[PDB]
């Protein structure tokens, strides 16, 4: 819903929102593991 149509694949733990492919390397808590 902010990058259209690429399907989520994993979850962010610290903030309760799932992570897509395009935003995985620049997520909110992209960097025990989040």
């Amino acid at each position: 819903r902010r990058h259209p149509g690429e399907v989520y694949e994993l979850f962010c733990s610290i903030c309760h929102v799932a992570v897509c492919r395009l935003c995985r390397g620049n997520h909110l808590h992209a960097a025990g593991r989040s």
Partner: protein
């Protein structure tokens, strides 16, 4: 101003990088105008503004999007390993290929990250210049003072490592190709003549 700096610290640690760069920029401006330039408060804020300019310009080159998280898309299962999950490990055994170059050319030519890398270079050079200028002269007042030097040289090494991470990661692909080919002619020369081995490892004396 100290509230605005640590709010940008919490916003960078939580993850929102643009509004923390804006918030730390306003704090850096007012702290520079009132309370000098050689204060460790000013140096910490300007190192912080440079640090987010590093992070918003290098998160895509260090970690490209790629097509990972799918067994047949990162080897692993091909080597007998039964999945890894952790992205720090999926990046490690990802093979580079002819199809990834759409993303490779995307990331290197992305303008938003490129000029944030350039704005990073400007802010770390001013950080390095100020730490070096402030370390030329001591402070003479009427008190017993410690070394106050191990933190000054630690910020100098911080403003040397971080400058070279940005400047080297911001290399144009034709330049990186020419450097890689130069290392190729160095590497292929080792099974050669004595003059070729020395001349490919520079040695431009004769």
């Amino acid at each position: 101003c100290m509230n605005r700096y640590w709010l940008a610290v919490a916003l960078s640690k939580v993850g929102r990088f643009r509004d923390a760069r804006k918030e730390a920029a306003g704090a850096l401006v007012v702290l520079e105008d009132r309370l000098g330039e050689n204060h460790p408060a000013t140096l910490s804020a300007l190192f912080f503004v440079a640090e987010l300019d590093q992070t918003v310009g290098c998160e895509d080159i260090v970690a490209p999007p790629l097509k990972i998280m799918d067994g047949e898309d990162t080897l692993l299962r091909e080597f007998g390993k039964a999945a890894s999950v952790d992205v720090g490990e999926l990046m490690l055994y990802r093979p580079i290929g002819p199809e990834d170059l759409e993303i490779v050319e995307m990331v290197a030519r992305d303008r938003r990250r490129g000029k944030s890398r350039q704005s990073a270079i400007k802010n770390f050079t001013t950080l390095f210049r100020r730490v070096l200028s402030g370390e030329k002269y001591l402070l003479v007042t009427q008190a017993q003072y410690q070394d106050s030097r191990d933190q000054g040289t630690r910020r100098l090494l911080a403003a040397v490592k971080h400058t070279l991470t940005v400047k080297m990661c911001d290399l144009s692909l034709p330049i990186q190709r020419a450097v890689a080919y130069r290392l190729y002619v160095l590497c292929v020369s080792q099974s050669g003549s004595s003059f070729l081995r020395k001349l490919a490892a520079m040695d431009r004396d004769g």
